Amino acid sequence: QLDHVDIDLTDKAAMQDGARTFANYCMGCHSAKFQRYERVATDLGIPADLMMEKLVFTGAKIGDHMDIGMKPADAKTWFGAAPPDLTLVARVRGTDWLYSYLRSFYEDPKRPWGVNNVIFPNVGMPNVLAPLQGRQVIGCKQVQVVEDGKKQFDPLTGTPLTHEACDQLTVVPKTGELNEAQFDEKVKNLVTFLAYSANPNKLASERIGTYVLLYLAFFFVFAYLLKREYWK
């Protein structure tokens, strides 16, 4: 069961925060090698000098690909699975899958890295966002009551009516920098940046396609008139 996330690719600030998160917490193991720092800066509105100073940690040039020092074979040996390139991961898995996966890490001592994932069971990825999210466990917490889709909110306060469930992802209090909403926004910005990276032509594609479709409607009007006429 995935969680929906409304990802706005026109939000430059969100994509910038996601790019910062990716450059700091993610490029240690994951590459974005099909994507250049120069294009990322141009599309996110980041000045080239700012991109160089803040997001390029590997000594690469602005026009270089987002390569990392960790080789896939070395990382496969170390983690048991190679950390895949994340340029297209939004297209491979979708944004909802990524949003649910990055928020579904929970402590699991039976696992090599002490964590497991609800979305990706027995994943070989360590919980690298634990400092932000905090300790997440499969414990008992309050969940909104639902009966055959009969979802109960509080009529007055508008907040959910909850009952205890004992197989839920609960963040241990005072264990991470960000609360649930702040970590939700962090993961949303990261997934927004990943969605941009997978499909950097989306906005331009929509604009060009709108113009193309307008032209094709015009041309269809003319071709239809030239057909129905001349068929008399």
Binding site: Q16, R20, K54, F57
Partner: peptide, 16 residues
Amino acid sequence: AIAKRLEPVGKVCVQG
């Protein structure tokens, strides 16, 4: 605004 948004996570304390 962008610079603050893009600040690297790792902070290093340096002599002087």
